[PDB]
Amino acid sequence: NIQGITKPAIRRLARRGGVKRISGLIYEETRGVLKVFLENVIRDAVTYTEHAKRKTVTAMDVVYALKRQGRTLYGFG
């Protein structure tokens, strides 16, 4: 499942980040930190959705969660 995100995607990301050369040990650690980041945001998004009594999460819940984390995403209204 986290195996669905797979090496070429990580490579492409790192290339946008200018990583010229990339050791084989990095893919598991990047999966790790990605899982942590997702958990840390989903926790709050789900919490907002629960408090709204809804069963549907919304982009507003996500951007609220991110703003609470302290990085702000424009363009989703």
Binding site: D44, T47, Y48, H51, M60, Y64, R68
Partner: protein
């Protein structure tokens, strides 16, 4: 010119009556409690505004605690709050 000092002494005497506390440490506590109060109230306000609701009630602070606190701290704090409001409303 209100401050929390006496309440701090009450909780101190409950947890550890054996020991005093420096006025510096008291000023630290008075800063900390005000900071966390401002934080949680700010979050509760953000919640109520987001829901377009007019009012703050227990459910708003209950959610904001689950947002601001570490999970285990939230788990205990929300329990204490539930107990407190249960007693208050029963009384």
């Amino acid at each position: 010119k209100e401050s929390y000092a006496i309440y701090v002494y009450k909780v101190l005497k409950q947890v550890h009556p054996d020991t005093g506390i420096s006025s510096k440490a008291m000023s630290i506590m008075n800063s900390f409690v005000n900071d966390v109060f401002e934080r949680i109230a700010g979050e509760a306000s953000r919640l109520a505004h987001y829901n377009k609701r007019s009012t703050i009630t227990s459910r708003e602070i209950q959610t904001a605690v689950r947002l601001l606190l570490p999970g285990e701290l939230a788990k205990h704090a929300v329990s204490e709050g539930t107990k407190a409001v249960t007693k208050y409303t029963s009384a």
